[PDB]
């Protein structure tokens, strides 16, 4: 019995450890968020199927790593779901062929936010999975330890909803003028969703974000966002109603707004956060 990754990295007879480098494509699902499907990444086979049958389980102590360590979830093993990190050995998968066959493991994260996310840097450890292999022939009891690494920079969603982009940059026309902000949100199932803006504001109405341009800044102007032609104050819930699998545009537009005093030439920049909330 031996195993290999999609990229040819092998663990031989007797077990051992290997790194698995995965191009992650995490996604929200109903009730759980996919982190990584390893059934396309890890393969094993029985070396002598005519006389021996191999038994393969996911062993207790399999867990997330790095920045996913604070989160709990589920693991789907051979069509059934179990708590993850694993607290008990799973039922077995039978390996009875010399032909490589997937190790049927997929990792999920339990939603805890509305539309939050955890940023993963490429090269980061995201999970450690313990494959236990025994057989019906002798007393072999081997461990195949799979260290799962993110191959790419990615955001793992932690909520029931996800966004078109986690960072959006827009350029306004030269003062005066406006520009739409492309930003949509969708949810795995229907959610009563809203959002609020965050940032430093200049006015008592809490609706004009300050100009924080560092180099050659303009004076006298800030940035104000509108939705449906209506100014959106910061720290105030905008209701999107019920949001489902079809993406819904937040309908945001950026504008300049005078903050007082002389308007002098220079650069303008405002950094504005969006945070979603269940209502």
């Amino acid at each position: 019995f031996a195993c290999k990754t999609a990229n040819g990295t092998a663990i031989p007879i007797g077990g051992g450890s290997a790194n698995v480098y995965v191009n992650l494509a995490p996604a929200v699902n109903v009730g759980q968020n996919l982190v990584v499907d390893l059934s396309t990444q890890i393969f094993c086979h029985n070396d002598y199927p005519e006389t021996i049958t191999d038994y393969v389980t996911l062993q207790r102590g399999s867990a997330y790593g790095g920045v996913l360590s604070s989160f709990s979830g589920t693991v789907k093993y051979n069509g059934s779901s179990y708590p993850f990190p694993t607290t008990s050995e799973t039922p077995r998968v039978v390996y009875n062929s010399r032909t490589d066959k997937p190790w049927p493991v997929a990792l999920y994260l339990t939603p805890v936010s509305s539309a939050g996310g955890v940023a993963i840097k490429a090269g980061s450890l995201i999970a450690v999975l313990i494959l236990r292999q025994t057989n019906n022939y002798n007393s072999d009891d081997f461990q195949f330890v799979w260290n799962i690494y993110a191959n790419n920079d990615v955001v793992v969603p932690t909520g029931g909803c996800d966004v078109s982009a986690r960072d959006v940059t827009v350029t306004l026309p030269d003062y005066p003028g406006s520009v739409p902000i492309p930003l949509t949100v969708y949810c795995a199932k229907s959610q009563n969703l809203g959002y609020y803006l965050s940032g430093t504001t200049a006015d008592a109405g809490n609706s004009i974000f300050t100009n924080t341009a560092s180099f050659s800044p303009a004076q006298g102007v800030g940035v104000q966002l509108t939705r449906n032609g209506t100014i959106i104050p910061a720290n105030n819930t905008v209701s999107l109603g019920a949001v489902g699998t079809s993406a819904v545009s937040l309908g945001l537009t950026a504008n300049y707004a005078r903050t007082g005093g002389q308007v002098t030439a220079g650069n303008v920049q405002s950094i504005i956060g969006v945070t979603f909330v269940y209502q």
Partner: peptide, 13 residues
Amino acid sequence: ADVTITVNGKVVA
């Protein structure tokens, strides 16, 4: 925040 929006602009003479 869930999403960070950066808005860039300029005031000309």
